[PDB]
């Protein structure tokens, strides 16, 4: 484990929960 | 002017059903992009350590062997204050804090048993090179509820008992504990 | 009514609006599954480690024996969780995480064996200096589908057989496992 | 004089001024002793390791053995500088600092002994492969108050006795120490 | 007014030749301050690792031994897909990637060879203290082009062959590979 | 109007002596919050190291063994450039520089001394299992002023002397040095 | 012409301009050679390690054996590349970089030899309990300028002789090297 | 020893010498 | 190797290539 591998996994599930919050914002205004 | 409505009714009714197809086929990429995600969030939380517990001290402190040595560490709430038996395999997180009860690593060196010691918690074993070592014994050798199995002049000792000197029991020299019993068959 | 035409030219632009940005959220998520998978793939990429596995778990976890110690490890989606045969060289990326599966380390200490056990999963092995140890045997010695031998005075069989009390087994003393059969001729 | 009343109403508000902020510097310092002590306590808190000590230093420092090497090492206020017997499992927190004092590693290699020495603190022990080493003995073998023994053909007493040239001692070949007596059977 | 020019012509012609001297003697401290510089830029790039090769895999992946263990890692572009021989010395960088082909570290434990194995890749050897071990053989023992050397009633084996059972070959017990042949003279 | 003064004189004289009490009882928490403080500033400065000295080089460089290996390092002002004897126990800081002179760790392996060497610095010893080794000797074995003690036809050898072939001396195989003498009594 | 005087008063201030800043670029570069050299010097400064070398490379690189493994390693400008004899104690700073050269490990495992080899660079040594190994010989045993024996039945010389099949050699089992001869008394 | 244990000991004797300098500033103006 | 030894070698060949670029700027305007 590295200080570079730990900072690439916090940035992948962080552009993630940003897509999940735009994701459930596209499924509720399309109804 | 009838054509006019038709043309719409027919775009609607044919964008509608493209809508619904894209819906579902876009959901089906969420159940896949979700269960695929959380399997990478588990591959992020650190792995676990195993080791052998020497004894209980009287707080929530315990003596364990682990990576080559003997160290004392804390018990998370979730595990049994003192109802973890003497010298079983246990488990450790990252920062060496205890979390689970286990069994009896039944694999290692085999020794013969010379005598139990003075205070029935320790024993003298000879190993493979004629050499004399001192090991403690882990619970399932001293708990009261254990028979004498009558004599040996009627034979079949395949089942549990009290540790009669002349026995083979299994030990982890480095650690310091014994682990259980073994038939010698001629 | 000239109100019906205007009511539809609306629902039409209504659907065409949601439709233009659905056909795109797919194109985004469809990328991220192609990015996540791309990352799981990028684990197995070297530099990479090795070491045997003592047991299987239910929650996609395992008992390996890398670098001299017992360790419970998080394994990869690339992985067939219960087609993991007991005691099989497995592989690890840096922060230990299991990627491929391999075979059976086929080199090291040669011991001869004295008998199997009640457990039938474990055996008494005598190494060289008359040291008697206890290993488990990896499946390929108690997969049921093994022939029952016939004697060895109508010459050299040494063809996949059932485990006989006199053979020579190849072991990793330091982990706890046997690995395979072997001929000796005198 | 109406000047005496005004001269005092001053010294009164003079004292009441220093008094209001004395009753407070205490309350601050009184906290910091409750914080410092709180920190020294927080040392002994696990995760925590062990290892034996070789000798006493005067300036509140000590000669320990932990992970293979000899190490002079700072010990805690919590701690009793003089009551540290020679060769006694002592405990350590991460950055090596002594916290508790313990008993006596009571497990390991058994050697038999040949004679003490001029030093009476050091003895010649023969282990298993006729390998004669030199350990120190922890005090509980040369405290004064040890009975001289009387012979052993009126049976196995093995009470706390004076070191006899044929006994078995338990040793840590690595540290340099003995630790206690032990009965052999005839 | 002639003196006047002279005085200049003479400063010029005498600052000119101080110019040129300083030129060259200032260059000569660049060829020294340059070749001295780059020899410190090489003392900056990290140093080189040596491993031992185990098997080839199909990708650009290979099994090698290094600090203690057994690990798979990648190959640089500049080296040869499959034309690096089963078990030779090889070389590594910082983050453990391969670069160079070596030979056959012929220095380590000596054993006798009992019988070859089933599949002409592995062998049973006895060490020094009678211990039976299993090593694989590096190429220059199974390369097809090897003489059977006739009998041994006419003697002088200083030259290569196929490894008759009862040979001295040279092994790195830890690794698992037999590196070459050796005589037993008169 | 007399009451008036009294009332003040009596508040003054009774806040005054509350003043003084708070004074002293607030000092007494400084002698405690100070001597308690600096004992935690010492528990901050790093720990010491022990290693054995080989030879002296001519600068202020010296050859010492320490954490397993052999290393050369500098000598702080406060110690004697050369007048620290052949291989005594010595002491180390953090970034491995020497501070103190020591004794002669007199504990470890025991060999017999076959012959001294050519250049009166080194010797051949048999160890425990017949193995021949070569150690250098630390001063108190060659320093000029040592008796030959006559012979042994009249006996009592408890006292120092010159190294006879056949003696017992105490050695740290790993390191390379022999630390002193020992009797075999009849 | 009053144009010739003005044409020169120019070339004079032209040269005086370049000359004033040449006499200075020297003074700068002259400093940086006194800084770079100052840095190379600052390598050999302790703390510093040791350990044998196995072979020479052409481009100011080397095959050392420090801390257990084999390592090609960048070496210093301070150093004479090809003046390095094979099997010499050499010296290293933190990030391994060779700075000094030394002698020959003159201590450790002692062992008898059986014969030289084809290579006459390599020999068969028998260690203590019959463990026949293969080590390289450091130059000092096959330099040209060594006399050929004359027998040893008209008494002990141990004056630098050429290598004979019965003598004793001091070896570092680990690296793979011999180091020197030694007298054995009969 | 850690980079977090080292930064907690420079902050304890730093709120310390700040109390010792207010400390000898309260004992000299009270006289 | 340290985080302090690595930052002293990038600053030595950096006041270097700054002197080498002023160096070949003094040898070409002096001709």
Walk me through the structure.
The complex is a heterononamer, with three copies of chain A (31 residues) and six copies of chain B (186 residues). The longest helix of chain A has 7 residues, at 17-23. Chain A has helices at 6-9, 17-23. In chain A, 35% of the residues lie in helices and 0% in strands. Chain A is built from two helices and no strands. Chain A starts with 5 loop residues before the first helix and ends in an 8-residue tail after the last helix. With 31 residues, chain A is mainly alpha-helical. The radius of gyration of chain A is 14 Å and the shape is rod-shaped. With 186 residues, chain B is of the alpha+beta class. Chain B has a five-stranded antiparallel β-sheet with strand order 3-2-1-4-5, with no helix packed on it. A five-stranded antiparallel β-sheet of chain B has the order 8-7-6-9-10, with no helix packed on it. Chain B has helices spanning 2-27, 30-35, 38-41; strands at 48-56, 61-65, 70-74, 89-92, 98-101, 109-116, 122-126, 132-136, 168-171, 178-182. Chain B contains three helices and ten strands. Chain B has three domains: 1-48, Single alpha-helices involved in coiled-coils or other helix-helix interfaces; 49-107, OB fold (Dihydrolipoamide Acetyltransferase, E2P); 108-186, Beta Barrel (OB fold (Dihydrolipoamide Acetyltransferase, E2P)). At the D-F interface, helix 1, strand 4 and strand 9 of D face helix 1 and helix 2 of F. Strand 3 (70-74) of chain B pairs antiparallel with strand 1 of chain D.
